[PDB]
Symmetry: C3
Subunit: 217 residues, 3 copies
């Protein structure tokens, strides 16, 4: 069950790695590779260093656009489990200040560069993407990332897969605000008809609606 | 008004970028590129990431001496506005501990490596240059950098342009010590007949004398 | 007395640099270069940046396996005196949290990445090596590194040379625990018949036994 790559749009790729989570078998986690002119940028590691090193190699060897920098969408091991590989492979890593503090607390390696988007609704442009902090949801520090050329919204773990009603790992969730965070992301990026959850298949905006329903108070 | 490069001496180049500062039009900021055997070092970013990326590209493509490391002469956006570009482009950045703390406070990105020159008069050798902390002046953390082969003193923003009497952005100035800081730099580097201010043209030691006069208590 | 390289095993090299320590003449310090498939990893700097830059160049030019990352075995200038060179040359550096804190206190540059092995007996795998914190000895933060293919134990400064009875620089030593730390390292890596001290020649396990004897309460 090695790392998979699939095209989502012009210059936009999904990476997927798998980890057995007992007693439930293999759980996928998804991130993105986004091409620029002669390099690429990364959204999230995979589960560990070996999977993450495969992603770096694939961008270099298949796209011929080496990964120069990355952004991490919250402090859990599906999104930051491969930080050491990124650092050793010359990738310049970015996360929010809160994400880095939580990463250190949780035994994960922090990113090298801090983004300051602590207020709900804060948005910044990063490497041609829009990063939004929509408020706490799956994790207090969760961020979303929008690719406005193809109109692809990376919801990460804040967006649940398909029509599930399961909530996933809620150890760090903000159960009170999660549905509002989803609405905030949906309202910020109305043109994005492709939505990417971490733990399921690419879908459309129906997975924003389903997630907001199943997590609503 | 794109980034300009001009030769100051053997292996020493000035980079200049421009920013409109309302209501006064385009304001230049200057830094240096200094060649070593097969790489170069940088003094200051330009105003932003795009200008700073042009500087990195020009060293690689025109000098064939890629920028390996940089030093930043205080925590303002003319000197550190391009830090993210440097970090993404593999440049190893240096600043004093005070500069990094002020950068974080001011919303700028800190350098990756800390120099400890906190006492007035402290000097260190860095990549064949002499770095001096002459005391607070234009900004409490301002440093100067001397290139002793061509005898070029980079005064940065601590040295005002030409015969102006205007003081520039004094929000963070040490008005009591600035003239003494200028004298300290002048006495430390007597052989340097080329003096580079951030916001005006290269000149000689008369701009040390003029600055010390116009900022004197 | 320039930097020396000697083969210890398949893909494992010792680097040695020298520094005059008045009034006693030239003192060697040793570290390792360990090959991987198309890159190498480094154990310790040499005494300063120039020596450390020679090591980086030799891995690139002679092994054709550039140094990608390094580990530092405690916060003294024989092990971390070349950090600035590593950082400028693109090496991703690692040390324990305690080592980094001591480095900053002692005027050395900290590593870029923190390992958390603070409890006596903690072991981690790093780049195919086993890193062990055996407890305080030569320095409170000393770690050892084992290369299990050739069975080479890098004892660093925690292991004294040959049959000496001298203790070296004990400014930061844990004289009460040092012999137990040596025993802990010996028991953790029983198969390693090649043992490398920082300040003497490669030897066998007799230098573990001698060190434990001469430092025992
Ligand atoms: Zn999560
Ligand atoms: Zn997740
Ligand atoms: Zn300024
Ligand atoms: Zn200025
Ligand atoms: Zn030592
Ligand atoms: Zn030593």
């Amino acid at each position: 069950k090695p790392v998979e790559f699939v095209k989502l749009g012009t210059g936009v790729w999904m990476h997927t790695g798998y980890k057995v989570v007992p007693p439930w078998g293999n759980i996928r986690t998804n991130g993105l590779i986004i091409e620029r002119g002669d390099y690429s940028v990364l959204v999230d590691t995979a589960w560990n260093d070996a999977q993450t090193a495969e992603i770096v190699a694939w961008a270099k060897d298949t796209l011929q656009k080496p990964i120069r920098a990355s952004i991490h969408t919250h402090a859990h091991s599906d999104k930051m489990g491969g930080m050491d590989a990124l650092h050793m492979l010359g990738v310049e890593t970015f996360a929010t200040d809160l994400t880095n503090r939580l990463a250190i607390e949780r035994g994960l390696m922090p990113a090298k560069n801090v983004l300051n988007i602590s207020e709900i609704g804060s948005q910044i442009e990063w490497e041609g993407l829009t990063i939004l902090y929509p408020g706490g949801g799956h994790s207090e520090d969760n961020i979303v990332v929008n690719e406005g050329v193809n109109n692809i919204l990376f919801g990460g773990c804040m967006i649940r897969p398909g029509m599930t009603t399961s909530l996933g790992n809620i150890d760090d969730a903000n159960l009170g605000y999660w549905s509002k965070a989803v609405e905030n992301a949906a309202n910020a990026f109305p043109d994005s008809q492709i939505v990417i959850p971490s733990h399921g298949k690419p879908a459309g905006r129906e997975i924003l609606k389903n997630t907001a329903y199943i997590t609503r108070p």
